[PDB]
RNA sequence: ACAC
């Protein structure tokens, strides 16, 4: 899947592209095209998946527009929201078994691969065996506090 | 709330 495309959500009715330009400028995140602002959400592409990930980590839930914290996520069309998830803000020196002991509560883990990342926290992509499993895992693990880190879970494109 |  195309992992450099971002979805930006939780925007106020009169969010303008200039607002998003400013936010990305100050976070030192390059974009490769213009911001496309709809109603309450928007889209923009980054030059590559590394910048797109840095944007999610730096911005999402963290920077405000008109007092509303923006959401920044991988852009994933509904038909590609199936089995695959990305988990971020994992405590740095956590070991597989502890993470795994969480993951298997929601189904069978076909694949799990760690993502290279600037931050001290870890990031992994996970493939479950069905759409239903992945949805439950997202619903119960997003926001889960683990060794004082808040896990963040979201869809990445599935084929 | 993921693009007439």
UniProtKB/Swiss-Prot annotation:
Tree of life domain: Eukaryota
Coiled coil regions in record: none
Transport among keywords: yes
Subcellular location: Nucleus; Cytoplasm; Cytoplasm, P-body; Cytoplasm, Stress granule
UniProt entry keywords in alphabetical sequence: Cytoplasm, Isopeptide bond, mRNA transport, Nucleus, Phosphoprotein, Repeat, RNA-binding, Translation regulation, Transport, Ubl conjugation
Domain RRM: 4-77, 83-158
GO function terms (MF aspect): mRNA 3'-UTR binding; mRNA 5'-UTR binding; N6-methyladenosine-containing RNA reader activity; RNA binding; translation regulator activity
UniProt keyword Cell cycle, yes or no: no
Tissue: Expressed in fetal liver, fetal lung, fetal kidney, fetal thymus, fetal placenta, fetal follicles of ovary and gonocytes of testis, growing oocytes, spermatogonia and semen (at protein level). Expressed in cervix adenocarcinoma, in testicular, pancreatic and renal-cell carcinomas (at protein level). Expressed ubiquitously during fetal development at 8 and 14 weeks of gestation. Expressed in ovary, testis, brain, placenta, pancreatic cancer tissues and pancreatic cancer cell lines.
GO biological process: anatomical structure morphogenesis; CRD-mediated mRNA stabilization; mRNA transport; negative regulation of translation; nervous system development; regulation of cytokine production; translation
GO cellular component: cytoplasm; cytoplasmic stress granule; cytosol; nucleus; P-body
Subunit structure: Can form homooligomers and heterooligomers with IGF2BP1 and IGF2BP3 in an RNA-dependent manner. Interacts with IGF2BP1. Interacts with ELAVL1, DHX9, HNRNPU, MATR3 and PABPC1.
Function: RNA-binding factor that may recruit target transcripts to cytoplasmic protein-RNA complexes (mRNPs). This transcript 'caging' into mRNPs allows mRNA transport and transient storage. It also modulates the rate and location at which target transcripts encounter the translational apparatus and shields them from endonuclease attacks or microRNA-mediated degradation. Preferentially binds to N6-methyladenosine (m6A)-containing mRNAs and increases their stability. Binds to the 3'-UTR of CD44 mRNA and stabilizes it, hence promotes cell adhesion and invadopodia formation in cancer cells.
Family membership: Belongs to the RRM IMP/VICKZ family.
Extra information: Autoantibodies against IGF2BP3 are detected in sera from some patients with a variety of carcinomas.
Free-text comment on this protein's domains from its UniProt entry: All KH domains contribute to binding to target mRNA. Domains KH3 and KH4 are the major RNA-binding modules, although KH1 and KH2 also contribute. The KH domains are also required for RNA-dependent homo- and heterooligomerization. The integrity of KH domains seems not to be required for localization to stress granules.
Protein name per its UniProtKB record: Insulin-like growth factor 2 mRNA-binding protein 3
Complete-protein stretch covered: 1 to 157 of 579
